[PDB]
Structure 1
């Protein structure tokens, strides 16, 4: 019922205690240890379970969380994060006068149809595995005048996208922008790890 967590808390307290027992602790850490020691005393007396017994049970529970595969996440060959945009560029507000958008590939593609005869460069932040795109964080279209006129973003509620879905989204965005006689290019990052 409630003993599973109590036991986990008692073991994790022990672990934090051992951390303190080996120095390096800041004052708020020791303060939390004191508050938790008092709270665990209370919870123990209410439950009737000795702190060391609970600690050992917690140890076995924590091991159970960490048993079997544990955290041996050796199936993600060090993805490298590549960026063309700063956090401000990704979070910057923008608007479309004649908005146009669609969903495909678990990606949302947006572009302003009011943009005409402009020169546009695409910038993106994304993860790369084996010299190819693996996850898209964000792509935005900027005019030479600095306006944001299009965007490709992942949809968090759908099964994740692939590199080919992003390549298709980029091609679709470029096509739609080119319709209005815009000149569209991509950064070297996109040109090297993705495709126009």
Structure 2
């Protein structure tokens, strides 16, 4: 059987659609997720925001995660690769780890939105 998914996001349409580039690229393909990070970004305050699929008041699938600075610049991204099989809850948690890890290594203050917290807390 099949219910019919809705989407809950921390980001506005523009924040999600917006094209961005990295001065010093770094990409990892952990799980079935693509993790992008600009290694030229240092000593900034980053906020991890996300878009999740939601079935019965519960977050199910990660559609898109993006790292923003206080000024509003995209510095990182976690997104699923359509070609590969569906990502797991652990894959999402590990990806966020890799992104937070990498960003903090360049002396950045990384905080996450309650939506990512709730997702991670419940898997």
TM-score normalised over the length of structure 2: 0.89
Asked which structure has the greater RCO (Cα within 8 Å, sep 6+), the reply is: 2
Asked if 1:91 is matched to 2:17, the reply is yes
Question: For the pair shown, which has the larger CA radius of gyration, 1 or 2?
Answer: 1
How far did residue 129 of structure 1 move? 4.3
| Aligned mates of 1:165, 1:76 — CA distance in 2 | 24
How far did residue 144 of structure 1 move? 0.6
How far did residue 180 of structure 1 move? 0.7
1:29-53 per-residue CA deviation (whole Å, 9 max, x = no partner) reads xxxxxxxxxxxxxxxxxxxxxxxxx
| Aligned mates of 1:98, 1:195 — CA distance in 2 | 32
| Aligned mates of 2:121, 2:44 — CA distance in 1 | 21
1:54-113 per-residue CA deviation (whole Å, 9 max, x = no partner) reads xxxxxxxxxxxxxxxxxxxxx445644211112211110111111101111111000000
SS at match of 1:99: coil
SS at match of 2:19: coil
Moved more, 90-99 or 125-134: 125-134
The structure with the greater share of residues assigned to strand is: 2
Q: Are the equivalent residues in 2 in contact too, given 1:126–1:138 (CA < 8 A)?
A: yes
How far did residue 185 of structure 1 move? 0.8
Moved more, 123-132 or 80-89: 123-132
The structure with the greater share of residues assigned to helix is: 1
Aligned length: 122
How far did residue 158 of structure 1 move? 0.6
Q: Are the equivalent residues in 2 in contact too, given 1:80–1:127 (CA < 8 A)?
A: yes
Which runs of no fewer than 5 residues in structure 1 stay unpaired?
A: 1-74
TM-score normalised over the length of structure 1: 0.57
How far did residue 194 of structure 1 move? 2.3
